Amino acid sequence: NANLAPLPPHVPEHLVFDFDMYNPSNLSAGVQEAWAVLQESNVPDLVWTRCNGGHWIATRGQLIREAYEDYRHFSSECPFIPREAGEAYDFIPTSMDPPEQRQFRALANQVVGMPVVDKLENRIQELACSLIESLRPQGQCNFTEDYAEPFPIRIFMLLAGLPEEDIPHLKYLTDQMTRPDGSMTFAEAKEALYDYLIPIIEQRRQKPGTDAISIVANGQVNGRPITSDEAKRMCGLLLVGGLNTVVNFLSFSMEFLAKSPEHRQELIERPERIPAACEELLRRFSLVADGRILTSDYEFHGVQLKKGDQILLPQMLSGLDERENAAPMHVDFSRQKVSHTTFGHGSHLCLGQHLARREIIVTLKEWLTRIPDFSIAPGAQIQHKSGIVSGVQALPLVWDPATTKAV
Numbered sequence: 078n079a080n081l082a083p084l085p086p087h088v089p090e091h092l093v094f095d096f097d098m099y100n101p102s103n104l105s106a107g108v109q110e111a112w113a114v115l116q117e118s119n120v121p122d123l124v125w126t127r128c129n130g131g132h133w134i135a136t137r138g139q140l141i142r143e144a145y146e147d148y149r150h151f152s153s154e155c156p157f158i159p160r161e162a163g164e165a166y167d168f169i170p171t172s173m174d175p176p177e178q179r180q181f182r183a184l185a186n187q188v189v190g191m192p193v194v195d196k197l198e199n200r201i202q203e204l205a206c207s208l209i210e211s212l213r214p215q216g217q218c219n220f221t222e223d224y225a226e227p228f229p230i231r232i233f234m235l236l237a238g239l240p241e242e243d244i245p246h247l248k249y250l251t252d253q254m255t256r257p258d259g260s261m262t263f264a265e266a267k268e269a270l271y272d273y274l275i276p277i278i279e280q281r282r283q284k285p286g287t288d289a290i291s292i293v294a295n296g297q298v299n300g301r302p303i304t305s306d307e308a309k310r311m312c313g314l315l316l317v318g319g320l321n322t323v324v325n326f327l328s329f330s331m332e333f334l335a336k337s338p339e340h341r342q343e344l345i346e347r348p349e350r351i352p353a354a355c356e357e358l359l360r361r362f363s364l365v366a367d368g369r370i371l372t373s374d375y376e377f378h379g380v381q382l383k384k385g386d387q388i389l390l391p392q393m394l395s396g397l398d399e400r401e402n403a404a405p406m407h408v409d410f411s412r413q414k415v416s417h418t419t420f421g422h423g424s425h426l427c428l429g430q431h432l433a434r435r436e437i438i439v440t441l442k443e444w445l446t447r448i449p450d451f452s453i454a455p456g457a458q459i460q461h462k463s464g465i466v467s468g469v470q471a472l473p474l475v476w477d478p479a480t481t482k483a484v
């Protein structure tokens with residue numbers, strides 16, 4: 078096939094597995110299911126795909142975790158596939174490895190961490206309730222556009238102090254960086270995101286507000302003032318994380334709940350399990366997959382990796398690995414040890430995970446409280462899209478208003 082890059086001389090031909098992270102062959106079975114083909118009986122722990130320019134792929138949690146811990150060998154400098162995207166990628170602190178990464182990560186943690194999450198509580202609460210109540214009597218909705226997107230995105234735009242009317246443009250840009258439809262390269266999308274931020278950053282460095290952008294823009298990096306460029310590279314990252322992650326995860330979770338009344342009933346009858354349900358769904362419907370670049374030749378698990386080689390370390394796969402969780406594809410809200418790397422692993426552990434869990438848990442209880450019974454619109458063939466961050470194309474839900482209830 079013309080879509081396969083010539084196998085480099087150092088890569089064993091028996092380790093070739095032409096997986097396409099942007100269009101996996103088994104996609105129709107579900108995106109997680111599609112990626113899980115990498116964990117079928119005769120697939121090695123580490124394979125090489127000739128797709129998207131050619132790159133390694135760690136298929137088991139053990140290797141994924143090990144690689145994310147070894148930043149000296151596996152650098153975040155070029156974290157995205159294809160290589161061109163990885164090279165243009167300069168977001169802070171994600172494109173940096175410790176020790177340099179730390180001073181910036183600390184600043185980022187200050188704008189989206191637990192303390193700020195605690196502060197957004199009521200607003201997150203209020204927004205969830207207002208959106209769901211308005212949908213309730215209608216007995217129908219396009220979940221992705223009617224909740225998954227507006228709920229977490231409006232919260233983020235609130236935190237960032239940006240007008241909601243800017244969401245369409247920003248959402249399109251961040252979409253192109255994770256699930257490219259082809260109308261824009263990662264570099265072009267990045268250039269546009271930065272173009273958007275530049276004047277906003279300059280404005281808030283002059284007239285500081287209390288929003289996340291102002292805090293970053295006027296912040297300090299281990300004692301010294303952050304620069305305009307640094308603030309741009311950090312804010313750009315925050316925007317990408319805030320407009321694509323929780324948005325897509327909510328859809329995977331709700332699609333599942335819509336197709337399984339028994340689980341819904343479990344959460345209805347016993348709402349104290351929602352948090353545990355949240356973690357299990359985070360494991361089962363994990364959706365992120367970025368990676369690293371080899372800093373030098375290095376033998377990893379019996380495989381000769383060469384400097385410059387890119388290796389995809391799918392955060393999504395660790396928790397689906399049967400060597401981490403028995404019956405991985407089964408959703409068990411009572412699962413004893415929910416093992417996963419959904420929020421990453423190592424020095425780059427998701428800073429917005431606390432905000433994400435809050436948004437997910439609030440969604441689960443507030444939705445189930447008002448719309449206990451709902452299903453996927455009859456005949457609907459739900460479609461997933463694969464990428465750095467996988468998602469659900471559309472999720473038409475239906476329900477009988479009579480079975481609902483105001484709160």
Ligand code: HEM
Pocket residue numbers: 153156169170171172182185189314315316318319322323326364365367368392418419420421422424425426427428429430432433
């Ligand atoms: C379902 C929700 C989310 C998932 C699954 C998720 C997942 C991840 C993953 C896997 C990484 C590590 C990437 C790497 O190691 O290269 C990461 C990093 C990060 N996430 Fe999230 N994330 C979520 C929500 C959020 C939200 C809402 C924000 C808020 C803006 C956010 C902010 C960040 C930041 C700033 C980093 C970079 C930290 C660093 O590089 O040191 N995330 N996230």
Ligand SMILES: CC1(C)[C@@H]2CC[C@@]1(C)C(=O)C2
Pocket residue numbers: 168171255314317318322365366367465466
């Ligand atoms: C892989 C990610 C989820 C993480 C936050 C946004 C994202 C797409 C990045 O570029 C780093």
Ligand SMILES: [K+]
Pocket residue numbers: 084085086087088089090
């Ligand atoms: K070879």
Ligand SMILES: [K+]
Pocket residue numbers: 154155156163164165166167172
């Ligand atoms: K780079």
